[PDB]
Design a protein around this nucleic acid. Sequence first.
RNA 1: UAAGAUAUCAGAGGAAAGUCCUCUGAUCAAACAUGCGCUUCCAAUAGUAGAAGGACGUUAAGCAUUUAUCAUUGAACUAGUUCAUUGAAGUCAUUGAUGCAAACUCCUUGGUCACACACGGCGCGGAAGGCGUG
Lengths: 176, 74, 135, 92, 26, 52, 75, 124
Amino acid sequence: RYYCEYCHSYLTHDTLSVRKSHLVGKNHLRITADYYRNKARDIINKHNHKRRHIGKRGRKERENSSQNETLKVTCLSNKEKRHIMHVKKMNQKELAQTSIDTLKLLYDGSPGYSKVFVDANRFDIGDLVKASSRSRDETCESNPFPRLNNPKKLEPPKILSQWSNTIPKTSIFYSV
Amino acid sequence: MVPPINCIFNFLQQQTPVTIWLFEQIGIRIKGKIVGFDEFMNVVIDEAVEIPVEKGTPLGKILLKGDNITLITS
Amino acid sequence: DKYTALIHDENFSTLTLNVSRYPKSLAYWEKLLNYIVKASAPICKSTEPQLLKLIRCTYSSMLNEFPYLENYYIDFALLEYKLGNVSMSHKIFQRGLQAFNQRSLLLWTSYLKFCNNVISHQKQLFKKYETAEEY
Amino acid sequence: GIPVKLLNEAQGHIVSLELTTGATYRGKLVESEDSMNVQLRDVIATEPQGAVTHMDQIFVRGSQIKFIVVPDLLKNAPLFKKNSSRPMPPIR
Amino acid sequence: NHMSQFIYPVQQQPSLNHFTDPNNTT
Amino acid sequence: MRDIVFVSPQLYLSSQEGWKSDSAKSGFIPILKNDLQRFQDSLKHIVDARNS
Amino acid sequence: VSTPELKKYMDKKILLNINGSRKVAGILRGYDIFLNVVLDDAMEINGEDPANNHQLGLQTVIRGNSIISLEALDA
Amino acid sequence: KIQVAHSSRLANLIDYKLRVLTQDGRVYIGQLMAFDKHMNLVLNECIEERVPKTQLDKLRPRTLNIKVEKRVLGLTILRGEQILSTVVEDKPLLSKKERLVRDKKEKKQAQKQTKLRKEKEKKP
RNA sequence: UAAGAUAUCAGAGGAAAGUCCUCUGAUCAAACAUGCGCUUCCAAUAGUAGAAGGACGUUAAGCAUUUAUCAUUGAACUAGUUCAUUGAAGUCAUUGAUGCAAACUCCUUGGUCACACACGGCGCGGAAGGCGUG
């Protein structure tokens, strides 16, 4: 007999094709997509709880650290730490999905932009994406002069929220 | 489609002379008419000659073993 | 064959002769190329050497008129990549970076992406990035 | 046997090879059969004396494979669970 | 997951005097 | 090559040597062998301005 | 046991390496469970492209104990 | 170094960092995870180690030091045909007592899933 | 891919030959316990250490070596050599690759346990085996 252990279910009618109908079935794909999403975070979320080995401290260092004053520690509340871990987890999700693609935005009206950045129609990748519009025929006859009320200004540089109040308050020149 | 065992058979009945490249170690090519074959692709060759790699001796009726068959060519 | 059927076509004789009449216009160089690729549409190792050598001398003669076209140095390597000789793909990034005097961003970005896959040697692949960042 | 069942778990991910001639292929793995023979798509092929090329599609007799390197996140797919509890099968 | 990592910077104007007009020529 | 020839106008309008070569030389444009006369006919006026 | 699925390959030009050094390009007709393969209009490739290259025969069948790789040089 | 159990077959020594030899004189050293009827095996974080041709005159009979050129390749599936022998290198990260503990908690947890699945399939 | 099987041996018994089945011995195996003056290992604080393993780290363009296409045509030339043109293929590298050696930095591991500073065992563990009974 045969079964798929992501779904945990046995196949009802065993043939080769019923397997392939289950192997590329919508239900089964959503399981195996979700199964590896759980094993991804679990290696990171279950952080290596290391084992400590405490040495018997010296007579010398015990006197040199006694004269040194005891520093204050900061412990947050349970309600506080449940929110701050909700934030810091959601922040690391953002740094995954940045993908800084300003450079594609800069060469928009150039003479080979269809052939290099559209990426349905390169050579290296182009045959593979057609399986799984802005065509390759585009030349520099259409849109001769870019600035004819068409172009958008460059989106300004991003900044950190936490340190949003380090910015100089006034601009040097008067913008419109 | 044209399966190989099907297409070995179309040298048997057609009586065409074939050349058969062997395993690269031995260093000879055999040629002559393929009379008949088995399930294990070992064939009998009629009026065979052993060419080193056009001065090679004639063999006669030779049963060739199917481990050493690399190509069979017209 | 596909090659000789393209020479005896009418549109090849007019688009070529247009370029030799008006070299620096570009929009005729661009039509001479955009047409000649589509006429060999399956552009794999299959297609015949007379048609590939001709589509190589269009590119390499066209970049010798317009050395500042970043995309057509990328697009000419990828055609040499898919056809499958990465020796000749490097050689035409080297000739692209030297055209800009080593200091163009799009070339060094779309060189290194490619260069990750084919260098397969640790110390030398980081040497590409050390040489890159100083320019 | 798990060694082979793993290779089916790696469809559509980048893998490597090493044929017993001493070549090294590395491209996305499209098909595999039970005799450990594979079809790779969009590959980079390294000849035994170092020469590298690119080829779109390749097939290899499974008999000549020396090893396959798989993505490292399948190290904890459920082939490797020792104690597994399958449910009672449906009646045919 | 309410707030975000980054914002575009907002900034105050310098009130438009003769010394800080970017179109000025005289 | 066959049925193709490499020509550059910058060496021809200035009337210099080697303005055509059949081998794949650098900076030359590939035109059909039969169309070399239709090439020369178009540049005749500019050669008349260069001459006179 | 199972037949190798080269169903998408057939009737395209195909280069393949026989044992170690010899490379043979032809148009693939048929195949079997052992990967013994048969192809039309074969040509043995070498270092010099037109010079050392010579054609083999009209139909040739290869044993699957000498296939290493089999690249499909077409779509 | 490490003393292996005097009657321990290849099925027993899962997680033991092995030292597998192929026919060409190249060695793959890693944690074993599966095996098979015809003895092809899945190592976890293996490293291939080769003696280069230049160093090999040094191993001919006369402290020797050998420059072993190694390359990382994580999670392989070897082939059987190629293996020549195996030898044991390290022992697993977890104890012998602790590998029984993790079995019984997983054997308990696996059974809990089925009964929670069967009663979620029965009524709905 | 399929079929078959679930330790072997020997004896007594039930339905001259063999099979089927049952309790009695021997041997074999697994799991579990449990012992051995059994074997090996388990890191400074009376000090700023050290052991095993690494580094796909640095010094470092170290030092010492050896390597960078073939064919066709003309000129000069000694009696091979250089220059120019035409074709063929061409991993990248020469700060490389190959051999030699050191120093430094940094990473993962553990009983950093208890008693004692005392002229060839029989402290309490844990880890790894070997051997023996049940």
